Amino acid sequence: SPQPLEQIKLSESQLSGRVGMIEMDLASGRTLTAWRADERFPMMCTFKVVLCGAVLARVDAGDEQLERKIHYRQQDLVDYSPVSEKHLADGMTVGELCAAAITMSDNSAANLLLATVGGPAGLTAFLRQIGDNVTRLDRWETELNEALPGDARDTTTPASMAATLRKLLTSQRLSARSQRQLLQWMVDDRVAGPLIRSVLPAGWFIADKTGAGERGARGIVALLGPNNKAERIVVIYLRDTPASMAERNQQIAGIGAALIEHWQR
Numbered sequence: 001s002p003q004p005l006e007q008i009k010l011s012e013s014q015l016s017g018r019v020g021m022i023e024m025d026l027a028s029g030r031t032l033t034a035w036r037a038d039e040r041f042p043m044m045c046t047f048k049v050v051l052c053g054a055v056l057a058r059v060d061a062g063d064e065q066l067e068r069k070i071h072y073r074q075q076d077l078v079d080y081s082p083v084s085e086k087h088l089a090d091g092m093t094v095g096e097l098c099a100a101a102i103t104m105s106d107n108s109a110a111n112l113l114l115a116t117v118g119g120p121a122g123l124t125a126f127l128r129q130i131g132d133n134v135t136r137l138d139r140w141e142t143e144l145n146e147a148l149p150g151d152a153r154d155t156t157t158p159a160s161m162a163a164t165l166r167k168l169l170t171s172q173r174l175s176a177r178s179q180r181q182l183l184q185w186m187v188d189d190r191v192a193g194p195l196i197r198s199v200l201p202a203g204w205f206i207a208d209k210t211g212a213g214e215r216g217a218r219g220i221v222a223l224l225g226p227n228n229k230a231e232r233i234v235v236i237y238l239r240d241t242p243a244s245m246a247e248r249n250q251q252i253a254g255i256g257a258a259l260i261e262h263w264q265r
């Protein structure tokens with residue numbers, strides 16, 4: 001593999017699309033590798049980590065319980081609801097909805113949680129509350145995936161998302177139990193986690209959330225490190241590429257491979 005930045009540049013030229021990336025030290029917040037870190041990219045389902053953070057904040061404040069069972073109707077369901085479509089009769093707990101959102105990319109589960117935090121405007125208010133003045137959510141699932149060229153709606157930057165993920169997981173803004181829960185949901189990802197593990201060398205920790213949208217939009221937010229320890233936050237977004245899903249996945253994997261190959265720096 002080339003140097004990480006070398007590989008990122010190659011990925012851009014090969015995809016004919018824009019890549020944004022940050023590698024951040026989890027412990028200190030130091031930015032190690034950065035590419036288009038201040039440019040905007042659609043969040044897609046990566047927003048669900050921030051969403052579940054806002055839910056956990058309500059739990060901490062006594063305004064919510066993970067145990068609380070939410071009942072919903074078929075008319076509330078949107079496109080891609082692999083878990084929520086199964087529970088029209090018996091409902092789902094807030095915690096279950098969070099797990100389905102993060103680990104399964106369940107879009108209806110995400111919308112149900114989004115309602116509880118005051119919709120996109122409420123989640124954006126939460127982001128401002130934790131010191132993120134850049135990330136914004138404007139729409140619900142699935143319109144938030146539209147990824148129109150130059151549209152600032154439903155976007156983050158690699159640098160803002162990495163800082164925000166660090167704040168949620170480690171800054172003690174969330175309670176100890178809530179920090180642990182948010183991490184565990186990411187550890188439990190069923191969309192990409194097991195596939196990623198299958199191609200990681202022995203000893204590499206992974207926790208993640210993925211997303212996909214229109215016009216080639218693709219993304220991952222992850223915790224990664226050797227010696228079975230979450231050492232770094234890695235955030236990678238792609239936008240405005242006509243490439244196959246397979247090649248988008250392969251390019252993101254290649255950036256990851258470059259980071260692993262050139263880890264010690």
Ligand SMILES: OC[C@H]1O[C@H](O[C@H]2[C@H](O)[C@@H](O)[C@H](OCCCCCCC3CCCCC3)O[C@@H]2CO)[C@H](O)[C@@H](O)[C@@H]1O
Nearest residue numbers: 196199200201220222224234252253254256257260261
């Ligand atoms: O010398 C370091 C390592 O180099 C290779 O590991 C390869 C591995 O065989 C390959 O499958 C992976 O592809 C990359 C797959 C990573 C998954 C995507 C990463 C995601 C999640 C984390 C954030 C970025 C995106 O690269 C590494 C590094 O070259 C060797 O196979 C392995 O024995 C050795 O320990």
Ligand SMILES: CC1(C)[C@H](C(=O)O)N2C(=O)C[C@H]2S1(=O)=O
Nearest residue numbers: 044045080105191210211212213
């Ligand atoms: C699983 C996905 C490819 C993708 C993912 O998590 O990779 N999710 C979203 O952002 C919506 C769902 S999806 O498009 O079905």
